[PDB]
Amino acid sequence: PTEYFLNTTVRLLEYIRYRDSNYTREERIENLHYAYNKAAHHFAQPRQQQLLKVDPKRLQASLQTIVGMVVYSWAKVSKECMADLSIHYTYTLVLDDSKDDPYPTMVNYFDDLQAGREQAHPWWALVNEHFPNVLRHFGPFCSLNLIRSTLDFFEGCWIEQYNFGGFPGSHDYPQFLRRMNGLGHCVGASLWPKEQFNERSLFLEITSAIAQMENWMVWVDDLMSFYKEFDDERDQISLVKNYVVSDEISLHEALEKLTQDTLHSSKQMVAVFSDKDPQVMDTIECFMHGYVTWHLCDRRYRLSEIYEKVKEEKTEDAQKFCKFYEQAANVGAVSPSEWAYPPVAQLANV
Amino acid sequence: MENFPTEYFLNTTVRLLEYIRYRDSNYTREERIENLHYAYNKAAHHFAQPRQQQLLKVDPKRLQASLQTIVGMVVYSWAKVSKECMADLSIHYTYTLVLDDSKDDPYPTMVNYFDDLQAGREQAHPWWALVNEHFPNVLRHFGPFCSLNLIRSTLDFFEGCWIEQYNFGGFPGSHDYPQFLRRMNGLGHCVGASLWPKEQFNERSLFLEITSAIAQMENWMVWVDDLMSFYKEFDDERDQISLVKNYVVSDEISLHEALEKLTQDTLHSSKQMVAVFSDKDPQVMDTIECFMHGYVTWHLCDRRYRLSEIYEKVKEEKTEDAQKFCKFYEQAANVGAVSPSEWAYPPVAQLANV
Ligand SMILES: [Mg+2]
Ligand SMILES: [Mg+2]
């Protein structure tokens, strides 16, 4: 519940050059609706309705969070791409929320796979069937990265169910699990649609982006999610918490290790890509600011509950905060009623 | 540093061996020879089959040498698993070793990878065709969770080799690249998960320990390998990329500063492996203890790492580290130094021709 969030954020927004996202409320609304619309229609189909066991109210919320995440972060990709990426990252978020045991449905995973038989686990059944709509936007290398990260992610959610923060002294455990379910190579490779980027011409810059972006993305999220994952921790495990349990350190030391990493990550991100192919830098830069924007506005992070508490300050922290925060709401704050409609359950009913 | 930091290398090495508790075992030479031969024999008959001979484009000699080195690594490090399991892991780890010999671009063979997988059509890249066709023989020794770890790691490894075809050590300033690449081609989760056959271990009951072992074994293994390999690669102008060489290029540091990074990490991982597992299930700590010793013994005995050069150079010297090292070395050889003629026969080529 600290206030250190200030120096961490500003240093974070000034390091990446958080000069707001790259859109106009008109354009943001344009993409949000097209994305939501196609995804909303997809999840409302009978087959998707039957195999994806999810509470409507929650699927609706999950879909809206993701479309936001995508449209706001993958700014330079086509409308179709944002939409297909929204369907995929919505499947991942729904899995992250399941409590069903993967074990029994994973017993004949390879043999069914190798044989081309529908997977026993319903989530694999749907995602794999839909996957081509995501992969059509990319070359073979980027596709491999999307496939692996999603397979890793599935193991991550498997492990994340034992709600294990690690054995004390198991120093390699924390980051092991975090990379496992961070979709780092999925996110980092989906930033390069073959339509505007050549996978062979920019192989090296793309590879480097996947390696560096994997940590920036997950770390920044863990950072923005601190004010969230504690005000109502439910036997929760998290990168920050697992550091405590495993490295045997205090919460302040933990959240400090993380913040130091995020800053170094941001620093090297600019140092390495600043002078590379301008189009690459542009996508990278839009993701960072957009990902930040999305975090500041989405309900899921309740970052609103830290506005007025510092909107009456006069320092170099609680002040350079809202100066940025506000910028977020100027384009990031958009009433759902302007794009998220009709609700999924409604299309499903018809 | 045109000269190999012998003293530094010897010191770090002994610190490693002590940290892991390197010592004698109830695993005799006669037992090793039995396993070495059994694993080789099954694998040799496999790679000698025509289909395998056609699709796997590899120089016969190099195939022979790769198999013998992998059989030695498996038999000596997976000491607690069945003879069959040793044979099958042998076939698998040889496939992955051979893939590094390929120079052919995967790009055109991966354009329809997902659609073919989903449809159950044989993969276009011939390596994937063989590896996936033979996978079940490996996977049968394990449960679902450990199997998933074997499958992911091998897929990661394929991407790892693809990336290495570019001989790229990272952009100056790309600090996250080195470890990213090393984990991609390390087979960390493959190794870590293959240590637990469902025949003598229960994933569900030992999930927390197996998972932790994977996370920790991943880094121990790759770093111990980089370390013990530091001597053979020091003067090899052919091997341009490696974890340490990339630390140099990506982090913009000196070879010594980079080498220091590896050793600090290596010893800390060793200290934590012991600290963490000594008080857990006895069987687990045993499989874990055997792998580390086995793995080390292997590095010391396979002529590939040329460590006998460091031995024969300090064999006569009163310094502490030197004597401690040779003691560990001579210790390794007594049970490790086995002539190929006692188990690696007949040659694959011969079985293939017949
Ligand atoms: Mg979860
Ligand atoms: Mg190398």
UniProtKB/Swiss-Prot annotation, chain A:
Region ranges (Aspartate-rich domain): 96-100
Pfam families per UniProt: TRI5
Induction line: Expression is positively regulated by the trichothecene cluster-specific transcription activator TRI10. Expression is induced between 18h and 21h growth on GYEP medium. The initial detection of trichothecenes occurs several hours after the initial detection of TRI5. The initiation of trichothecene biosynthesis occurs with a high concentration of glucose remaining in the culture medium.
Binding annotation for Mg(2+) 3: 235, 237
Cofactor: how bound: Some of the cofactor binding sites show unusual localization within the protein.
More about this protein: Trichothecenes are sesquiterpenoid toxins that act by inhibiting protein biosynthesis.
Name assigned to this protein: Trichodiene synthase
Organism the protein comes from: Fusarium sporotrichioides
Lineage: Eukaryota, Fungi, Dikarya, Ascomycota, Pezizomycotina
Gene: TRI5
